[PDB]
Amino acid sequence: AVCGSVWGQNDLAYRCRTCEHDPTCAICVPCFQNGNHKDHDYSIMYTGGGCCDCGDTTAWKREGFCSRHK
Numbered sequence: 416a417v418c419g420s421v422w423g424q425n426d427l428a429y430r431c432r433t434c435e436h437d438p439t440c441a442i443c444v445p446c447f448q449n450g451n452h453k454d455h456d457y458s459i460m461y462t463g464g465g466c467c468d469c470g471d472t473t474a475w476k477r478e479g480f481c482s483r484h485k
């Protein structure tokens with residue numbers, strides 16, 4: 416249902432200010448690639464590590480879910 420991917424402090428991930436419900440949200444690189452964020456305010460960057468929010472309605476807009484957690 417919700418991507419269980421975890422990453423470390425020197426692993427890249429994606430912020431998307433269009434899709435997020437708060438500034439600490441983030442999704443993993445594969446979930447970003449397999450989703451639809453054209454014209455979104457997104458950035459690949461480091462996040463101090465984290466757990467993917469893709470598929471979690473409390474953290475991320477449904478339109479921003481990748482094809483595998485939608």
Ligand SMILES: [Zn+2]
Pocket residue numbers: 431432433434451452455456457479
């Ligand atoms: Zn987005």
Ligand SMILES: [Zn+2]
Pocket residue numbers: 418419420442443444445446467468469
């Ligand atoms: Zn993910």
Ligand SMILES: [Zn+2]
Pocket residue numbers: 418445446469470480481482483484
């Ligand atoms: Zn996903």
